[PDB]
Symmetry: D2
Subunit: 371 residues, 4 copies
């Protein structure tokens, strides 16, 4: 059966375990198992490592669907399928070592907080990376660093078991993502596990032509969109039956509630429609000879930021409409709200991420290397 | 050639004549002729009357494109292709009398301000209708009215001939729409020119299964969306070279301008994407045996209203960014701003039009006869 | 010596204990003692009971200043000084029994969830009331109920020790307010501990002429306004030295941060200025023969709701500006944000509370008995 | 007779003539006479020229009251009383020649668009200044320029006589302000009529210690605030009796109208309270030995910008609520809306004018010479 069908069954499992996911700040072993068996943690790795090489719009749709069940579970998918793309940047040898025959789930932090000095055979890298989503269930972490004098950063492929995982993920929401800090202490990395994203993939097929920084941003949008849909579902369910003490008209019988529901539904539908429209436009040209153009990359970053922010606006409105119900820890809207306003802090999709795409639109000078 | 190509060429003619359109509060005869030649003022009339019977997504796209050239010209298309749908509600006799062989352009006011007495072979109708967009170049006006005792309103097909057109269209914007008041003074209308929208079309093909009230609302969305895209285009052109003669930065080099352009471009792209998504979903089920369901109709009204409101927000932001430039009558953004904030007053797509679609979403009792 | 000065000092103690306040969901005994010794938990009780009978603007300024140190502690003041007004509604006998000689701290839940049936010399009452802020440190709770089958509700003064306090206050924010649910089970209340707010106070001096429902709503605004000032203070402190990449381009040096700081500072200051302006206008006419008029009462509720919502907007903007800093449990802004978005759920100051003051502004029929 | 009472009487005369003011793009001679006789066009000139030397809060209150009657007439007072301040910067001779014995009304454009070559006796200046509000009824225009090669601009006091007034004020709103372009062509100006605002006033009394750039900005705030109050007045009066055809309600009987009326009224009241709060605080320290500090100047610019932008938001909400009524030229709200969205373009109070006051709030390096 198609992976989208699988994803939508796993969403329902994630929803059933969402209290435990939050409590333990990690996915239960058997939810991870389901996710692994459906191919969703390696969906975007290349064919050579026994992986679906799933088209980006389908993969992002899967992440959105899981996020509707539970934002943290969906985010773990987003990060796993973004990190998975970097498997296509490794020389065949190290790629086969780490992900061959269906093995390897990847985490990844882009911030180049490592310092790598070169030695015979590779480099020695040290550093501390926060926000290592999914590290609890990943084998490998792709981590950013600077090698020697070099001013353009690099990526090293690290084994989790060479790293120290620090218990730092004490957060408003997205608690189940376990995005703890990781520490490398003079870890040796063979040369064939060091690469530069800017040199581009070794596996040169359309999935890896799709803008890689765009995909990362979109994956955060997929998780936020699915979370916001769940929030509208929560409010609609509550509003039919929620009755005042004094004024007995239900929540749903208030014209303001009706206006707000309509406003939120159309704002979310708009953001989601732009999201998949720009993904498909970029997927089509990822099949062409030339690099996907700056114009197209920009459209992906515009839509991803718009999706995360619109999603936060939608969840905030649903939370506010629920009033005193939602302030309590037992209320589902509470967690959607907390998760929505943790997702907005991400650097790829915050308010500041609108400015560079504005520069591109206004035909102003712009460093678009990471667009 | 495709009618969409014709539409974009007519958009550039409308743009070139936009000052005269506004000054005269009417489209120039030559623009009407071009519009008429391309089939755009009758695009959605049935095959029988020598008309394209154009699919709704294509028709609405043409209106959007003309509105990019000039909002008033685009609105005229919008109202002509919405009124044209009612040609499918006329018995074959009156239909061929008024629209046969390629003749007849329609205007239409839905507000049932007419008062109609039954007589032998028809009715005699009186009333005054405002907002008769396009009456300057229409032959026929479909007008709402109540017949005798009835609580459900009806529609009469009137010849502009029998009508007193009053000079009342002195407005902030959409001046070229000439949406004057029309008066009927004891006008006899034969019975085969009286019908009820609620009894459904006579021509029972998919274009006329498409929700007719939803089409009306969307047509205003189309005009607003096209006008908003022109406003962004105006700002981007202005900001390239506007330097405040007090600082060392053009307008385009200010971080705030960049953020605002990106916010507006993504908000518009999202509204447009939703607009055409729901039209295509409704278009598909318009081919099915059953009437298009309330759920589908609701999405069209949700997206129509979101498109007009978002469009206004977008134009307001571009107007504001342009500062002291835009306050002057010679500035293109001034007119986009005036037009955008005339379009928002329309009853199908104002803030109040969110409430009923909200009642539908919260599964509350709702009169959805005109959804 | 001046109670405003004491409020400031107690604010800084509340801030030093804010982690413990949150952890324990109650104020530490020693902070309660400070608050008691300053007169802040009884500041608005009549002078007959050895209380300051403090003017409403001074009392509300004290609540706001405590809230700046810690929102929950300030909220406790707000609810204490609002409930304390009802001491003026008790017959002199029961008033000296419960509050004589400086004794008694009051809590109060207005919702008439109680059912009371008249028996001999009084009533017996049962019910469950949520949101009993401060019950951990109050002796008396004023609880709303319906007596027999009257349609206008009454208030019973209950001893906390006759109630069952359920552990239900598990919430996004305002954790230290310990606003648990309280249950009465066939509690007997003597008749001179039963009254109706609508019959007016026994102590007929200006403080008790000041609109009582207005005071309650304003007390929520005072806590939200103080929390919001602390959020801005938190962001300004952080923004000076939050450096991005791996070196210097601080958060404070971004145009958007500057524009956002300015927007928030003027919005808060505007809300605060309207808050104290309407309090002082109402204070003056509370000295006149007639009841404070509906027009004045209305201005109080408009200002209170504006203060709470604007405060939430401010805190949300400061939280967002702080990005990945604020998602972590050790960040001050996280708690301001959680607290700000618990305060907004309160029924006196939520978005729905705009509608009735709107009806008064539009001179529409309105039931203003609880304005 | 107190000047605030004269102002509020003159407001009703301006109201009665507002159609003529807009048609002619100038105040009628009879209105100018009333204004001149009340002392409002010279209210802030020093005592030595037979002027009230009116405290700034009283002056700005008068400007706000006139703007409520008609925004353009209020704007004319705003500009006259801001320009009048510069009479305190002239040496005693030419103050006497230009303004002595109660003569002289001043206009003023701060933009240093003039180029002044020094000669014997003074300078020769040429330039073209847009936005010369009130030039139609002013005798003198203070205009910005650079003298020789200085980097700090200067001000010349020009007689309208020696200027070409060009007919360029064709604008969305504020039409009555006749803020035309003025051209100086090799105009000789005695050294006596050349000064730098930065050297400070010659008349060193509190009114001229009050921040002069702050006063200019606030004066635009006063006009925008008065205009916004009139827009709410317009709406409330319309909404009592506006019933649609099938609305089963008036506009006032809709929940959304009520909530919006209350939102707009509190937002305006908040902006107005902050406005006069910071004026009074700045007025107090204008009596102290030192210059008014930067933190105080900053608060005036914050409040000024918040007043103009909030006023625009208020007028847009009232316009939108009025729906199809307000689109027509005969609708009072239409002109309030056009005027409100003309005033927002002013450089002292646009969105960009939030950035410098943000830099002061975040204690960032800032050029505060024109704050
Ligand atoms: C819940 C959450 C999870 C995140 N996960 C990642 C991740 O797996 N990889 C990554 O490069 N960034 C992730 N980020 C964003 C990073 O915070 C970012 O690299 C950086 O620390 C932003 O802070 P700065 O202003 O100091 O540059 C995540 C953010 C959030 C809020
Ligand atoms: C109606 C109106 C009247 C104005 N009057 C004046 C004036 O009398 N003196 C002045 O220095 N600026 C005045 N301005 C300010 C200009 O509009 C504003 O500076 C301009 O939009 C910004 O120009 P810049 O980009 O070159 O800095 C006025 C603005 C408006 C909208
Ligand atoms: C943190 C918090 C504390 C509150 N404290 C009180 C209180 O001490 N007394 C009171 O009448 N309401 C208080 N409220 C308001 C009540 O929460 C509100 O009346 C109740 O939830 C409405 O319930 P309903 O929707 O079932 O009618 C508080 C609200 C919050 C969010
Ligand atoms: C520029 C403009 C053109 C319009 N044209 C039409 C039209 O051709 N047919 C129609 O039924 N409504 C049209 N409307 C909608 C009207 O705003 C609305 O039907 C009516 O004015 C108000 O009815 P009421 O009395 O119930 O408020 C138009 C609105 C605008 C702003």
């Amino acid at each position: 059966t198609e992976i989208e069908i699988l994803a939508e069954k796993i969403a329902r499992w994630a929803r059933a375990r969402s209290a435990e996911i939050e409590r333990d700040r990690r996915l239960p072993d058997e939810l991870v198992t389901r996710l692994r068996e459906a191919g969703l943690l390696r969906a975007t790795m290349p064919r050579e490592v026994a992986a679906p090489e799933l088209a980006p719009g389908r993969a992002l749709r899967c992440a959105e669907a899981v996020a509707r069940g539970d934002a943290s579970a969906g985010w773990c998918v987003s990060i796993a399928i973004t990190s998975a793309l970097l498997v296509a940047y490794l020389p065949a040898r190290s790629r086969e070592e780490m992900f061959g025959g269906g093995r390897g789930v990847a985490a990844g932090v882009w911030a180049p907080r490592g310092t790598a000095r070169s030695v015979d055979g590779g480099v020695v890298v040290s550093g501390r990376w926060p926000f290592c989503s999914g590290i609890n269930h990943a084998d490998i972490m792709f981590a950013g660093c600077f090698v020697d004098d070099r001013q353009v950063p690099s990526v090293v492929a690290l084994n989790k078991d060479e790293l120290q995982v620090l218990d730092t993920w004490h957060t408003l929401g997205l608690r189940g993502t376990g995005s703890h800090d990781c520490v490398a202490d003079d870890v040796f990395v063979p040369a064939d596990r060091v690469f530069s994203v800017f040199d581009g993939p070794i596996v040169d097929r359309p999935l890896y032509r799709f803008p890689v920084f765009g995909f990362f941003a979109l994956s955060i949008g997929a998780a936020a969109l699915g979370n916001a849909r769940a929030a509208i579902d929560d409010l609609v369910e509550l509003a039919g039956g929620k009755k005042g003490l004094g004024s007995t008209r239900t929540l749903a019988e208030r014209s303001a509630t009706q206006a707000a529901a309509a406003t939120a539904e159309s704002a979310l539908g708009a953001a989601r429609a732009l999201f998949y429209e720009v993904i498909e436009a970029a997927w089509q040209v990822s099949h062409d000879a030339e690099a996907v153009p700056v114009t197209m990359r920009n459209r992906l970053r515009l839509a991803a930021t718009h999706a995360v922010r619109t999603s936060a606006d939608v969840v905030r409105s649903m939370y506010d409409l629920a009033g005193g119900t939602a302030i309590y820890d037992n209320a589902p809207l509470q967690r959607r709200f907390r998760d929505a306003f943790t997702a907005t802090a991400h650097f790829q999709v915050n308010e500041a991420s609108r400015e560079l795409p504005g520069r591109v639109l206004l035909d102003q000078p712009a460093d678009v290397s990471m667009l």
